Amino acid sequence: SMKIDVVTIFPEYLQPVRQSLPGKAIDAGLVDVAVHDLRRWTHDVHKSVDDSPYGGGPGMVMKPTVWGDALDEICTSETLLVVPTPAGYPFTQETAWQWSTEDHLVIACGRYEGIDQRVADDAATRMRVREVSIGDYVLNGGEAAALVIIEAVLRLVPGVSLLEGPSYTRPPSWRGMDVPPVLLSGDHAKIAAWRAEQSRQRTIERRPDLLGFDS
């Protein structure tokens, strides 16, 4: 069974991990997900986790000291440390398959302008570290990305290309819109071929990159 530890300053926000696909995985005993408040490893009265960036710039950077202490306690040499960041390597379906075989994922959720780079650099001297992005958009922090990664990985664990075209179910006519007749015909070869043509049309239109075309 897999162990996933999530470290965040917003532990309550990782509640969606519950009943859902990850929730079912947890209750089936296929994974254990534990969420940790980063502030647990602070020592000052104000529980500060961030400070202004060296060299200037807007916002705050998360302090290495607190993160270092947290990861010391939670990680081992076998840990795969996942660091969600807009500046990361792309997280893809291939990545999800790869991580689905891991014994222990630790996900370090950052906020503000991110985590002092020395945290990942230091961790990499003792364990495998993967800084990853889940897409080309900006988030306030890594927490929502952690949920996406957990969803993409867990649905692949034992025990749990091109675009899929349109799908239909009953009734065969609805608001004057009919299900494509071929889908009702029971002709496997014809259905297979129609579904391939639909997938091609959709992939060209929506994701031409998947077929090696521009945009």
Ligand X SMILES: Nc1nc(Cl)c2nc[nH]c2n1
Is the alpha carbon torsion for 41, 45, 50, 54 positive or negative? negative
Q: How far apart are CA 114 and CA 133, in angstroms?
A: 13
CA dist., res. 83 & res. 49, Å (int): 17
Answer yes or no: are the C-beta atoms of 114 and 57 closer than 8 Å: no
Question: Using CB distances below 5 to 8 A depending on partner kind, what does residue 89 bind out of a copy of itself, ligand X, none?
Answer: a copy of itself
Q: Is the dihedral of CA 5, 6, 11, 14 positive or negative?
A: negative
Q: Which of 115, 145, 150, 154 binds ligand X (CB under 6 A)?
A: 145
One character per residue 80-119, x = contact with ligand X (rule: CB under 6 A): ----xxx-x-----------------------x-------
To a copy of itself, the closest distance from the beta carbon of 1 in angstroms equals 19
Which partner from the list ligand X, a copy of itself, none does 122 bind, CB cut-off 5 to 8 Å by kind?
Answer: a copy of itself
8 Å CB contact between 53 and 185 = no
By CB neighbour count within 10 A (0-12 exposed, 13-18 middle, 19+ buried), where does 90 fall?
exposed
- What residues between 102 and 161 interact with a copy of itself by CB under 8 A? 113-114, 116-118, 121-122, 131, 133-141, 143-145, 147-148, 151-152, 155
DSSP assignment of 49-80, as one string? -EEPPTT--SS-EE-HHHHHHHHHHH--TT-E
Q: Which partner from the list ligand X, a copy of itself, none does 84 bind, CB cut-off 5 to 8 Å by kind?
A: ligand X
Residues that constitute the known binding site for S-adenosyl-L-homocysteine: 84, 110, 133-135, 137, 139
Q: Which residues are annotated as a binding site for adenine?
A: 134-135, 137, 139
* Contact between 11 and a copy of itself per CB under 8 A: no
- Interacting residues with ligand X (CB under 6 A): 84-86, 88, 112, 132-135, 137-139, 141-142, 145
